[PDB]
Design a protein around this ligand. Structure first.
Ligand SMILES: NC(=O)c1ccc[n+]([C@@H]2O[C@H](COP(=O)([O-])OP(=O)(O)OC[C@H]3O[C@@H](n4cnc5c(N)ncnc54)[C@H](O)[C@@H]3O)[C@@H](O)[C@H]2O)c1
Ligand SMILES: NC(=O)c1ccc[n+]([C@@H]2O[C@H](COP(=O)([O-])OP(=O)(O)OC[C@H]3O[C@@H](n4cnc5c(N)ncnc54)[C@H](O)[C@@H]3O)[C@@H](O)[C@H]2O)c1
Lengths: 254, 242
């Protein structure tokens, strides 16, 4: 009947069809005291499909950034330095990417980096191999995945079974100087574990959009030279927020 | 005649005025594209960087990491673009230009371009739509130069180029310093005609002038296009064979 958009595509679709006199509420980025509700992002309702490509484009970005150290080369140049040897990087062609959770973003990531000649292996408890083989991902168990990977990237939801999906046990099986990406949720990579991997050279780089705490209190990872980061930007494009603004409003009419 | 390796090269090579001063000199051996060269020695590595630069421009990754590293969390400031459905202009359609094209095509990008000695039908084969340079400029969200440094290619992007570009055209140069007119690119960056630029290369290396490296909407590297373990290895052999 009456809905507030706490936080222009949404207002229009909803009208076409201070929360004291409100039936519904909409947001993007709701405490127990505050309590149909809708989130523009990934009876409560959200827009699962809206941020899929935009989160998937960031990941490919993180991957190439980790391969050629672009954000650490930029900061070097901006400090007036010309540091050639330091930033000797890695070629993606013929490397093996490991992808955890092959939902909406996993396959978008996988196909894209296939274009760069990356061999894409993967693992997912629900998505079948018949489905993964259709977008060039050979599914194997996690124990056959670790020692093959030059890069590993995570596109699973945050559950107990994924909370610490990459820990010390997993790093111990990976190739020396594995590179790692988390553009999904804070906690799927154990932050405790990723520092130790970084500190011993076991992990060669890391690209984080997400932290168990946001903003992260402990700065051990952010400040580490071989760690590049963003302030949870996976879903920060004009394209994505347009599509999430609609997907939510279309449902509210339904 | 013996051989001398001045610059920093990959071991495999060894195992397997200046010109004027040397009477014994018959052959200068270059490890790269830039007399013998390694034409397809470091094309991929270069293409892979170019593609990274486009990515970093689209989502302000270098800047965002600096922001985090300065103990800042500012979501609003780092609003980025989605490459899917955007148009990438590829000036020069050789080894690198086509490898860039097929990689970015995979992000659902429209690839238009220009190369004089490459026909529209050949570029068609690797997915790039050749049109006259005038028609190119206004269609582009993203421009990348992959030409040799030539008189004609010196300031190939100039004030006349940006005149015909979209408000907020983001530009990449992992080819040579000068191909993009540095003076032009700064004026464009200042008027916000060019939303941002990404540079591997400079007219002076290192550059004396800091206007472009310092600009907030510019990203940089100290000529890291050929700077992968794999690329230097291939080139090293690829010239030691020649
Ligand atoms: N970085 C951002 O700003 C941003 C924005 C949007 C999405 N995300 C996150 O990205 C993740 C994936 O999004 P999506 O749309 O691709 O999800 P999806 O729901 O489409 O797919 C999730 C997949 O993960 C798989 N999975 C679950 N547990 C697993 C495990 N233990 N091992 C392997 N696979 C497992 C599921 O079977 C499923 O295939 C989510 O965590 C989502 O919140 C982050
Ligand atoms: N950043 C780096 O470290 C790095 C590494 C490799 C190569 N490069 C440079 O990148 C450039 C491209 O190398 P390549 O491997 O593609 O060489 P290439 O010769 O295979 O391709 C360049 C193409 O540009 C075409 N061309 C000539 N004049 C043109 C014009 N006016 N407009 C458009 N196209 C024109 C040529 O005909 C040729 O087909 C070279 O200048 C090379 O030195 C840079």
């Amino acid at each position: 009947r009456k809905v507030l958009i706490s936080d222009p595509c949404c207002r229009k679709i909803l009208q076409d069809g201070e929360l004291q006199d409100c039936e519904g509420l909409i947001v993007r980025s709701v405490t127990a005291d505050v309590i149909v509700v809708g989130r523009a992002g990934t009876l409560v309702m959200n827009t699962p499909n809206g941020n899929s490509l935009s989160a998937a484009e960031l990941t490919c970005g993180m991957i190439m950034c980790l391969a050629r150290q672009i954000p650490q080369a930029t900061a070097s140049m901006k400090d007036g330095k010309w540091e050639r040897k330091k930033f000797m990087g890695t070629e993606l062609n013929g490397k093996t990417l490991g992808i955890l959770g092959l939902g909406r973003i996993g396959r978008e990531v996988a196909t894209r980096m296939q274009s760069f000649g990356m061999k894409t292996i993967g693992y997912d408890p629900i998505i079948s191999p018949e489905v993964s083989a259709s977008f060039g991902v050979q599914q194997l168990p996690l124990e056959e995945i670790w020692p093959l990977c030059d890069f590993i990237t995570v596109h699973t939801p945050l559950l107990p079974s994924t909370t610490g999906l990459l820990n010390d046990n997993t790093f111990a099986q990976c190739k020396k100087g594995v590179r790692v990406v988390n553009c999904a949720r804070g906690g799927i990579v154990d932050e405790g574990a990723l520092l130790r991997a970084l500190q011993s050279g076991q992990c060669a780089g890391a690209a984080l959009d997400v932290f168990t705490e946001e903003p992260p209190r402990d700065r051990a990872l952010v400040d580490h030279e071989n760690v590049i980061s963003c302030p949870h930007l996976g879903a920060s494009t004009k394209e994505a927020q347009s599509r999430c603004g609609e997907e939510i409003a279309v449902q509210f009419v339904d």
